[PDB]
Design an enzyme around this catalytic site. Structure first.
Site, PDB file in Angstrom:
ATOM      1  N   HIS A  12       0.833  -1.189   0.000  1.00 39.39           N
ATOM      2  CA  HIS A  12       0.000   0.000   0.000  1.00 39.39           C
ATOM      3  C   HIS A  12       0.880   1.255   0.000  1.00 39.39           C
ATOM      4  N   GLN A  54       3.267   4.004  -1.076  1.00 36.30           N
ATOM      5  CA  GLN A  54       4.238   4.348  -2.140  1.00 36.30           C
ATOM      6  C   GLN A  54       5.338   3.314  -2.433  1.00 36.30           C
ATOM      7  N   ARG A  59      -7.981  -4.237   1.397  1.00 35.19           N
ATOM      8  CA  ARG A  59      -9.089  -4.377   2.343  1.00 35.19           C
ATOM      9  C   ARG A  59     -10.392  -3.865   1.730  1.00 35.19           C
ATOM     10  N   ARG A 107       1.743 -11.515  12.858  1.00 37.30           N
ATOM     11  CA  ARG A 107       0.589 -11.579  13.764  1.00 37.30           C
ATOM     12  C   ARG A 107      -0.714 -12.013  13.081  1.00 37.30           C
ATOM     13  N   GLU A 117       7.840   9.128   4.310  1.00 36.07           N
ATOM     14  CA  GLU A 117       8.849   9.665   3.376  1.00 36.07           C
ATOM     15  C   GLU A 117       9.920  10.558   4.020  1.00 36.07           C
ATOM     16  N   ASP A 150      10.607   6.543  -0.161  1.00 32.71           N
ATOM     17  CA  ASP A 150       9.564   5.598  -0.584  1.00 32.71           C
ATOM     18  C   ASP A 150       9.897   4.908  -1.894  1.00 32.71           C
ATOM     19  N   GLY A 200      28.943  14.670  -5.599  1.00 28.73           N
ATOM     20  CA  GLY A 200      29.804  13.651  -6.232  1.00 28.73           C
ATOM     21  C   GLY A 200      30.324  14.033  -7.611  1.00 28.73           C
ATOM     22  N   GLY A 201      29.777  15.100  -8.188  1.00 25.48           N
ATOM     23  CA  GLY A 201      30.341  15.674  -9.395  1.00 25.48           C
ATOM     24  C   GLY A 201      31.444  16.655  -9.054  1.00 25.48           C
TER      25      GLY A 201
HETATM   26  S1  COA Z   1       6.974   4.788   1.502  1.00 26.27           S
HETATM   27  C1  COA Z   1       6.086   5.445   2.875  1.00 26.27           C
HETATM   28  C2  COA Z   1       5.440   4.338   3.708  1.00 26.27           C
HETATM   29  N1  COA Z   1       6.438   3.565   4.440  1.00 26.27           N
HETATM   30  C3  COA Z   1       6.606   2.244   4.311  1.00 26.27           C
HETATM   31  O1  COA Z   1       6.326   1.600   3.285  1.00 26.27           O
HETATM   32  C4  COA Z   1       7.214   1.549   5.515  1.00 26.27           C
HETATM   33  C5  COA Z   1       6.405   0.333   5.958  1.00 26.27           C
HETATM   34  N2  COA Z   1       5.019   0.642   6.296  1.00 26.27           N
HETATM   35  C6  COA Z   1       4.626   1.124   7.482  1.00 26.27           C
HETATM   36  O2  COA Z   1       5.495   1.357   8.464  1.00 26.27           O
HETATM   37  C7  COA Z   1       3.154   1.380   7.701  1.00 26.27           C
HETATM   38  O3  COA Z   1       2.406   0.489   6.863  1.00 26.27           O
HETATM   39  C8  COA Z   1       2.735   2.832   7.428  1.00 26.27           C
HETATM   40  C9  COA Z   1       3.019   3.199   5.978  1.00 26.27           C
HETATM   41  C10 COA Z   1       3.475   3.800   8.342  1.00 26.27           C
HETATM   42  C11 COA Z   1       1.231   3.015   7.676  1.00 26.27           C
HETATM   43  O4  COA Z   1       0.856   2.561   8.983  1.00 26.27           O
HETATM   44  P1  COA Z   1      -0.570   1.877   9.335  1.00 26.27           P
HETATM   45  O5  COA Z   1      -1.110   2.600  10.543  1.00 26.27           O
HETATM   46  O6  COA Z   1      -1.441   1.786   8.102  1.00 26.27           O
HETATM   47  O7  COA Z   1      -0.144   0.398   9.829  1.00 26.27           O
HETATM   48  P2  COA Z   1      -0.215  -0.912   8.885  1.00 26.27           P
HETATM   49  O8  COA Z   1       0.122  -0.560   7.457  1.00 26.27           O
HETATM   50  O9  COA Z   1       0.712  -1.989   9.394  1.00 26.27           O
HETATM   51  O10 COA Z   1      -1.750  -1.400   8.974  1.00 26.27           O
HETATM   52  C12 COA Z   1      -2.396  -1.542  10.240  1.00 26.27           C
HETATM   53  C13 COA Z   1      -3.087  -2.900  10.352  1.00 26.27           C
HETATM   54  O11 COA Z   1      -3.995  -3.106   9.263  1.00 26.27           O
HETATM   55  C14 COA Z   1      -3.922  -4.482   8.888  1.00 26.27           C
HETATM   56  N3  COA Z   1      -4.427  -4.725   7.512  1.00 26.27           N
HETATM   57  C15 COA Z   1      -4.036  -4.105   6.391  1.00 26.27           C
HETATM   58  N4  COA Z   1      -4.735  -4.608   5.344  1.00 26.27           N
HETATM   59  C16 COA Z   1      -5.573  -5.551   5.826  1.00 26.27           C
HETATM   60  C17 COA Z   1      -6.518  -6.392   5.241  1.00 26.27           C
HETATM   61  N5  COA Z   1      -6.731  -6.356   3.929  1.00 26.27           N
HETATM   62  N6  COA Z   1      -7.213  -7.256   6.023  1.00 26.27           N
HETATM   63  C18 COA Z   1      -7.002  -7.301   7.350  1.00 26.27           C
HETATM   64  N7  COA Z   1      -6.098  -6.497   7.938  1.00 26.27           N
HETATM   65  C19 COA Z   1      -5.373  -5.617   7.197  1.00 26.27           C
HETATM   66  C20 COA Z   1      -2.451  -4.827   9.058  1.00 26.27           C
HETATM   67  O12 COA Z   1      -2.225  -6.238   9.174  1.00 26.27           O
HETATM   68  C21 COA Z   1      -2.114  -4.078  10.333  1.00 26.27           C
HETATM   69  O13 COA Z   1      -2.331  -4.959  11.435  1.00 26.27           O
HETATM   70  P3  COA Z   1      -1.826  -4.671  12.938  1.00 26.27           P
HETATM   71  O14 COA Z   1      -1.981  -5.983  13.667  1.00 26.27           O
HETATM   72  O15 COA Z   1      -2.829  -3.731  13.566  1.00 26.27           O
HETATM   73  O16 COA Z   1      -0.416  -4.142  12.802  1.00 26.27           O
HETATM   74  S1  COA Z   2      28.384  11.421  -9.911  1.00 29.76           S
HETATM   75  C1  COA Z   2      28.812  12.437 -11.291  1.00 29.76           C
HETATM   76  C2  COA Z   2      30.316  12.281 -11.534  1.00 29.76           C
HETATM   77  N1  COA Z   2      30.867  13.255 -12.472  1.00 29.76           N
HETATM   78  C3  COA Z   2      31.898  12.998 -13.268  1.00 29.76           C
HETATM   79  O1  COA Z   2      32.350  11.856 -13.437  1.00 29.76           O
HETATM   80  C4  COA Z   2      32.506  14.181 -13.987  1.00 29.76           C
HETATM   81  C5  COA Z   2      33.914  13.862 -14.482  1.00 29.76           C
HETATM   82  N2  COA Z   2      33.890  12.859 -15.541  1.00 29.76           N
HETATM   83  C6  COA Z   2      34.744  12.859 -16.572  1.00 29.76           C
HETATM   84  O2  COA Z   2      35.681  13.793 -16.709  1.00 29.76           O
HETATM   85  C7  COA Z   2      34.629  11.777 -17.615  1.00 29.76           C
HETATM   86  O3  COA Z   2      33.275  11.289 -17.689  1.00 29.76           O
HETATM   87  C8  COA Z   2      35.622  10.644 -17.319  1.00 29.76           C
HETATM   88  C9  COA Z   2      35.437  10.093 -15.910  1.00 29.76           C
HETATM   89  C10 COA Z   2      37.060  11.132 -17.490  1.00 29.76           C
HETATM   90  C11 COA Z   2      35.399   9.489 -18.289  1.00 29.76           C
HETATM   91  O4  COA Z   2      35.487   9.919 -19.645  1.00 29.76           O
HETATM   92  P1  COA Z   2      35.153   8.875 -20.830  1.00 29.76           P
HETATM   93  O5  COA Z   2      33.706   8.465 -20.710  1.00 29.76           O
HETATM   94  O6  COA Z   2      35.648   9.486 -22.116  1.00 29.76           O
HETATM   95  O7  COA Z   2      36.020   7.581 -20.381  1.00 29.76           O
HETATM   96  P2  COA Z   2      37.631   7.457 -20.500  1.00 29.76           P
HETATM   97  O8  COA Z   2      38.353   8.700 -20.043  1.00 29.76           O
HETATM   98  O9  COA Z   2      38.105   6.261 -19.700  1.00 29.76           O
HETATM   99  O10 COA Z   2      37.865   7.253 -22.089  1.00 29.76           O
HETATM  100  C12 COA Z   2      38.423   8.261 -22.941  1.00 29.76           C
HETATM  101  C13 COA Z   2      38.655   7.681 -24.332  1.00 29.76           C
HETATM  102  O11 COA Z   2      39.660   6.666 -24.258  1.00 29.76           O
HETATM  103  C14 COA Z   2      39.101   5.361 -24.438  1.00 29.76           C
HETATM  104  N3  COA Z   2      39.535   4.443 -23.344  1.00 29.76           N
HETATM  105  C15 COA Z   2      39.007   4.320 -22.115  1.00 29.76           C
HETATM  106  N4  COA Z   2      39.683   3.378 -21.422  1.00 29.76           N
HETATM  107  C16 COA Z   2      40.651   2.902 -22.223  1.00 29.76           C
HETATM  108  C17 COA Z   2      41.634   1.932 -22.055  1.00 29.76           C
HETATM  109  N5  COA Z   2      41.736   1.275 -20.902  1.00 29.76           N
HETATM  110  N6  COA Z   2      42.482   1.673 -23.081  1.00 29.76           N
HETATM  111  C18 COA Z   2      42.374   2.342 -24.244  1.00 29.76           C
HETATM  112  N7  COA Z   2      41.429   3.278 -24.429  1.00 29.76           N
HETATM  113  C19 COA Z   2      40.555   3.576 -23.432  1.00 29.76           C
HETATM  114  C20 COA Z   2      37.588   5.551 -24.549  1.00 29.76           C
HETATM  115  O12 COA Z   2      37.026   4.682 -25.534  1.00 29.76           O
HETATM  116  C21 COA Z   2      37.432   7.008 -24.931  1.00 29.76           C
HETATM  117  O13 COA Z   2      37.457   7.131 -26.358  1.00 29.76           O
HETATM  118  P3  COA Z   2      36.704   8.289 -27.188  1.00 29.76           P
HETATM  119  O14 COA Z   2      36.500   7.695 -28.560  1.00 29.76           O
HETATM  120  O15 COA Z   2      37.571   9.519 -27.118  1.00 29.76           O
HETATM  121  O16 COA Z   2      35.327   8.428 -26.589  1.00 29.76           O
HETATM  122 CL    CL Z   3      30.340  16.694 -12.716  1.00 30.09          CL
HETATM  123 CL    CL Z   4       7.317   7.663  -3.963  1.00 33.44          CL
END
Ligand code: COA
Ligand code: COA
Ligand code: CL
Ligand code: CL
Ligand code: CL
Ligand code: MG
Ligand code: MG
Lengths: 427, 427
Positions: free
Chosen positions: A14, A16, A37, A103, A139, A168, A259-260
């Site tokens: 249920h 998200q 339910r 349960r 969430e 979620d 991370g960039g």
């Molecule tokens: S992504 C955001 C949501 N977070 C999560 O997914 C994390 C896990 N989920 C939860 O912690 C809870 O489900 C949340 C989302 C917080 C909602 O809480 P509730 O108050 O709704 O608690 P429950 O979901 O556990 O439901 C309460 C009771 O209802 C019973 N139940 C559900 N469906 C049925 C059906 N079809 N038939 C009979 N009973 C049903 C559950 O078993 C639950 O029972 P308890 O014994 O009272 O826990």
């Molecule tokens: S969480 C966000 C993170 N942000 C970043 O990563 C930002 C920084 N990123 C960069 O500068 C590039 O994306 C890096 C990490 C340098 C990767 O660049 P490429 O995708 O071009 O990958 P390479 O540098 O490894 O490759 C460059 C060219 O050389 C060839 N090549 C790769 N590996 C080899 C090996 N082992 N041997 C021979 N050649 C290799 C690739 O094919 C590539 O060739 P092009 O034809 O020039 O694309």
């Molecule tokens: Cl970057």
């Molecule tokens: Cl979501």
């Protein structure tokens, strides 16, 4: 043909996280049966409705490619109905509260007895064995638990929630890896396993880069790529200077690169009236000559005060504010085009309106118009993974209890036996 | 038994998205062979090192459970080595620029010719077919492209990046779902496929809730639960009340709930000197009198304009402003326990120093201390999926070219062939 053709999914989920997981499994061909339910069903059906008495977009965007059965599971006859369904199932997914499924008399030990091959998959707030193991989590609490809120926003503001669903939907996608991994185990052993994802842990996995920073911060006392590393740049709300002299836990860095490589969110023309008129502009170390060309600062190419990462640390925010001055008369797409000429990483802040009507995203199947002849068509997000020999076929979310009789038929029950279940109000 | 035991992964990836996917595959038992450039290798190795000439934490936290081979792929003998490796590979993973492997002679059709069973998995910026097909995108640029930046932060501030790796690690986790799905397809068809995840689409998947909100806004002209919909609260830069009158695209809502259940981020004791001294407080409709018991306001249970969602969504920032006043003398953990007495969903903002050294997270294997005898031990994030029949064994990240000869001996090459490949400078 489709990855999960012939996989039967008993879906108790249920809200998200759980539904996100089982919907995506549905998109990859799984046979997903939604247990809900009676009368009310999934709570998302009635949250944030745009039309009275019509299932909300909250529900429909998380529950495509599913069938819905109604079931009171706290009844003897509802329990024997589950057992038959569990015996047909490949995977059971649930995101109730911690103790909820046990349960009801359906512990992992008992489920294993019913069906040796079935996988049990759960989403929880916290992992089993954690001090907060028994808590119900939503969430934004999950984002707070996993380090994201602490590391998002500005040094002089509060911890800030992300608009992305780090708690979620993210936890649901992680559980999908767990489920698919368990399916790979089963090919070897012939047995199902229990797989669990905590929302805190899914958030933490995405904040891995900040655990990197925490350790660098402990080991060295500074994070040179952060705005606070620039002397006299960052201040708190009372005007006290912020520097790494006194920072012992990873701070909020505003729009720093994470991370960039170093970057910033820069205004473009119309930022005063248009909330999304910005680009993100990255200063990569090996692209400084190209940046100097773009902004007409040739003197900055050969200056050691400007031409290395180390030289730029005491002035990086001054450099971004100067660059921003070059965008004052250009919109975000014009700036992105200009930067692209130089090979400089830079892109626009896309509004939700822009994304919803973007032809490219619809071309590639990422934004999809779902055909819904009952509610009217709506947009959803499709499968983010694209394959060479498979295309998802997204179909509308089920009405509450729409397939109850259809699935009971498949369980072997005949007309008279179904009539009794309706009369007893078990389904 | 581990899920991916016996899976050979030919890993070309660098930096974060790609290596996060293959590391996590390594944690689940995969045989990950990291192909690295002679003499330099993965860019992360020298990226913000905490110790001169020692591989950085960026590298070590994304490259555990991998072996490293140095290889010059722009040489005839290197291409011959790669062909032998592609024939042994189950999955090839890359995050090069578009067409990079094509330009090295390894198109998909040729890879299929070498090995009809191998899966080719790619991370990219934009989906194949997209108008921005060839724009460079990393982390925060991808957060901007996929709608997260537009919808994160405050109405009177800029679009804001998440501290969570919404672009890089999130795309890597999504690719891992794609790879596992393509392994399931292979079990049926006996053939490998291409699978690709674009960073924009990985981000979009997690902002599904904002695409919901964009349609609601288009359909109704208002989002009732947003701060902008509240009686004179949100004020624009010019100090004037905000409303959905001129809002046509999903706005930034600060620390609002982002779903059907309202919330806000609230200050606790020490907030002026401790940036993370906060709790998130969620008003969930199914425990409203419980909040009234804690808050000591019994008049709001009886009042119809306070006891329901529709009644309570115009007193909303008035309610949060009140509740925050009585957290003034308590730390975030004291406030969380005080709420938990009444079963209220309240959680603390966890700082990175708290998370890095939390005993519970290390007990469950989510924060793992890696035994690294070469560089000294470090922390990393483990597997966020917990399995009943399996435990990851996390081993330190490889030195550059550490397993070159080890890997060459597995291809079946003699000691004479290996030493001349070193001499030829192929490895
Ligand atoms: S992504 C955001 C949501 N977070 C999560 O997914 C994390 C896990 N989920 C939860 O912690 C809870 O489900 C949340 C989302 C917080 C909602 O809480 P509730 O108050 O709704 O608690 P429950 O979901 O556990 O439901 C309460 C009771 O209802 C019973 N139940 C559900 N469906 C049925 C059906 N079809 N038939 C009979 N009973 C049903 C559950 O078993 C639950 O029972 P308890 O014994 O009272 O826990
Ligand atoms: S969480 C966000 C993170 N942000 C970043 O990563 C930002 C920084 N990123 C960069 O500068 C590039 O994306 C890096 C990490 C340098 C990767 O660049 P490429 O995708 O071009 O990958 P390479 O540098 O490894 O490759 C460059 C060219 O050389 C060839 N090549 C790769 N590996 C080899 C090996 N082992 N041997 C021979 N050649 C290799 C690739 O094919 C590539 O060739 P092009 O034809 O020039 O694309
Ligand atoms: Cl970057
Ligand atoms: Cl979501
Ligand atoms: Cl990356
Ligand atoms: Mg310090
Ligand atoms: Mg010029």
């Amino acid at each position: 043909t489709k990855p999960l053709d012939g996989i039967n999914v008993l879906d108790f989920t249920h809200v998200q996280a759980g539904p996100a997981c089982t919907q995506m499994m549905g998109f990859l061909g799984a046979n997903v049966i939604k247990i809900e339910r009676r009368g009310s069903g999934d709570m998302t059906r009635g949250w944030l409705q745009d039309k009275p008495n019509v299932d909300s977009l909250y529900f429909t965007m998380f529950n495509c490619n599913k069938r819905s059965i109604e079931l009171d599971m706290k009844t003897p006859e509802g329990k024997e109905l589950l057992e038959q369904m569990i015996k047909k199932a490949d995977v059971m997914v649930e995101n109730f509260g911690p103790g909820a499924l046990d349960r009801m008399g359906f512990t992992w030990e008992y489920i294993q007895e019913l069906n040796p091959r079935v996988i049990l998959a759960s989403v929880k707030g916290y992992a089993e064995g954690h001090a907060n193991e028994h808590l119900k989590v939503y969430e934004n609490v999950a984002q707070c638990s996993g380090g994201a809120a602490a590391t998002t926003g500005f040094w002089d503001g509060p911890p800030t929630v992300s608009g992305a669903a780090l708690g979620d939907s993210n936890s649901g996608m992680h559980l999908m890896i767990g489920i698919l991994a368990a399916l790979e185990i089963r090919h070897k052993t012939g047995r199902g396993q229990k797989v669990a994802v905590a929302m805190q842990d899914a958030v933490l996995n995405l904040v891995r880069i900040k655990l990197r920073d925490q350790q660098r911060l402990e080991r060295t006392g500074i994070l040179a790529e952060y705005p606070q590393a620039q002397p006299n740049f960052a201040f708190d709300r009372d005007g006290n200077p912020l520097s790494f002299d006194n920072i012992t836990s990873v701070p909020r860095g505003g729009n720093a690169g994470g991370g960039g490589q170093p970057g910033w969110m820069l205004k473009c023309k119309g930022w005063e009236t248009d909330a999304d008129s910005y680009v993100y502009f990255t200063i990569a170390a090996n692209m400084w000559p190209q940046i100097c060309d773009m902004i007409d600062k040739p003197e900055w190419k050969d200056d050691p005060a400007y031409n290395t990462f180390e030289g730029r640390v005491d002035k990086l925010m001054d450099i971004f504010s100067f660059i921003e001055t070059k965008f004052a008369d250009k919109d975000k797409f014009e700036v992105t085009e200009w930067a692209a000429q130089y090979g400089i990483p830079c892109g626009p802040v896309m509004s939700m309106k822009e994304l919803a009507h973007d032809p490219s995203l619809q071309k590639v199947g990422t934004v999809v118009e779902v055909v819904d002849e009952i509610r009217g068509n709506h947009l959803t997000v499709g499968a983010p993974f694209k394959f060479s020999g498979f295309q998802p076929e997204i179909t509308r979310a089920p009405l509450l209890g729409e397939h109850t009789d259809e699935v009971l038929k498949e369980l072997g029950l005949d007309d008279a036996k179904i009539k009794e279940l309706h009369a007893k109000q078990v389904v």
